[PDB]
Write a protein that binds this ligand. Structure first.
Ligand SMILES: C[S@@+](CC[C@H](N)C(=O)[O-])C[C@H]1O[C@@H](n2cnc3c(N)ncnc32)[C@H](O)[C@@H]1O
Ligand SMILES: [Zn+2]
Ligand SMILES: [Zn+2]
Ligand SMILES: [Zn+2]
Ligand SMILES: [Zn+2]
Length: 466
């Protein structure tokens, strides 16, 4: 609830600190850098959050559901599990707590879909963690299972609550304990099961293979498992449509022959003397404006300042919701800070967009969307436009992204093929590690009374869309 938002914002803060530390290391000459030394940005970020009182459920073990943590949630670092109190050991696979005179397991990190076999702990002994997991069988107390998928992206997934049914002992060439767990009925489906079904021959609800019809480099399918509706009529466009008096003037370019770096390069200077992306392509954090290198920059395509201009990289699809029409999701998980897509449509003066008929549901009002909340919290740890994008008649997949009061995306202004700040590119970025098939949403930011109810379903919902 408030708990859900607290959890998400705590993880967001953590990754913000990680990527700021990394940004500061990447700003150094490639021998003053510590990443080789075995810099540990997750460890350092964890220490910073700890000293500033940001850990949740600290000093206590929890049996069963953890408030604000949901089945399917993903984590990049094991340390995130400790920050949230999901799983306390930094390395050990089994976490446990006192229970009556005994100890029972609270959580395991694990490397017929409701059934799981888990390997324990040079013979293994029935002590500590192994003994606790064994005791879970007798008490029939719940165990949280965190599944390791195997580096940016979700590496761990919360798969929910399980019961331990039995254990046995076998040669691993020394002796090991093995445990069989079974998922408690009534929980949301495992995300790996949902993904498996989405990859099927006969996948239910498939309406259209490609709503772009060949224009996108990768097809964007449409799925409807709710009703018989097919996707709405519109002309798919991967290119912005400019008025003629707004066609791009050649921007200032940089003379760098190698990839651009900083804390010489004009484009680094545009960004305030720093690189707004990490070297792995993820955005460090939202800013009012990001300047990418342009067509005449001497730098290679691999330039750290060339990200959103390369277009969609993720496998997107549109799908039917029960109460908000069509929305957008991704067939795989999305690492925090990843570029999603642009909001593409016709660029119009606000007055022109307003005058036109039938387009009100597909307008992106440019400007005043930078949220500096995170920048502020992080500092504690250590402009307007007269233009609108009309995607009603002509637009890309961006027109289908719904609103949420607790969104997993945000809009980011980007300039690269021109310097006209009145009409920046509107680029969406992830602000969570997003589970596969989770609906993608951002804050529409409509002012109330300039009525329509908000159906985003968040616990902190502001109740009205406008
Ligand atoms: C840009 S369209 C998004 C795609 C749209 N759902 C469709 O089927 O084409 C914006 C419209 O989606 C609906 N919508 C988006 N988010 C909503 C929300 N949180 N609550 C209620 N309706 C929403 C509203 O009808 C809104 O006018
Ligand atoms: Zn440069
Ligand atoms: Zn440049
Ligand atoms: Zn460059
Ligand atoms: Zn809402």
């Amino acid at each position: 609830d408030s708990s859900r938002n607290k959890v998400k914002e705590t993880l967001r803060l953590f990754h913000g600190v990680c990527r700021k530390i990394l940004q500061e290391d990447e700003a150094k000459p490639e021998d003053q850098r510590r990443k080789g030394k075995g810099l540990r940005i997750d460890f350092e970020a964890s220490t910073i959050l700890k000293r500033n009182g940001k850990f949740l459920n600290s000093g206590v073990h929890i049996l069963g559901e953890v408030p604000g943590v949901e089945v399917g949630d993903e984590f990049q670092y094991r340390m995130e599990l400790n920050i949230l109190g999901i799983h306390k050991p930094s390395q050990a696979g089994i976490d446990y707590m006192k229970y009556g005179k005994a100890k029972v397991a609270t959580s395991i990190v694990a490397s017929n879909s409701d059934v799981l076999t888990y390997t324990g702990q040079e013979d293994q002994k029935l002590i500590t963690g192994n003994l606790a997991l064994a005791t879970s069988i007798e008490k029939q107390t719940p165990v949280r299972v965190i599944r390791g998928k195997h580096s940016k992206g979700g590496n761990y997934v919360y798969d929910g609550l399980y019961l331990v049914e039995k254990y046995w002992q076998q040669v691993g060439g020394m002796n090991v304990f093995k445990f069989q767990l079974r998922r408690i009925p009534g929980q949301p489906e495992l995300s790996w099961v949902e993904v498996k079904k989405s990859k099927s021959k006969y996948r239910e609800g498939l309406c259209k293979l490609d709503i772009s019809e060949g224009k996108e480099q990768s097809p964007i399918s449409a799925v409807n498992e709710i009703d018989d509706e097919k996707p709405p009529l519109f002309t798919y466009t991967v290119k912005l449509i400019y008025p003629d008096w707004c066609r791009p003037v050649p921007p200032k370019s940089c003379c760098c022959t190698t990839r651009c770096t900083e804390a010489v390069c004009a484009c680094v200077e545009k960004n305030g003397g720093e690189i707004p992306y990490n070297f792995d392509g993820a955005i460090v954090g939202a800013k009012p404006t990001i300047y990418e290198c342009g067509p005449l920059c001497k730098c290679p395509s691999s330039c750290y300042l060339r990200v959103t201009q390369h277009g969609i990289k993720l496998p997107l699809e549109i799908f039917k919701t029960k109460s908000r029409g069509w929305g957008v999701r991704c067939l795989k998980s999305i690492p925090i800070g990843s570029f999603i897509c642009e909001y593409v449509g016709e660029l119009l003066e606000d007055s022109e967009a307003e005058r036109r008929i039938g387009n009100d549901e597909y307008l992106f009002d440019i400007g005043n969307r930078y949220d500096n909340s995170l920048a502020q919290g992080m500092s504690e740890l250590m402009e307007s436009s007269g233009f609108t994008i009309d995607a009603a008649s002509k637009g890309n997949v961006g027109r289908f992204i719904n609103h949420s009061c607790s969104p997993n995306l945000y809009a980011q202004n980007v300039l690269y093929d021109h310097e006209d700040s009145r009409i920046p590119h509107v680029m969406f970025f992830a602000q969570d590690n997003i589970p596969p098939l989770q609906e993608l949403c951002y804050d529409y930011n409509y002012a109330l009374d300039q009525q329509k109810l908000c159906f985003c379903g968040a616990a902190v919902c502001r109740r009205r869309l406008y």
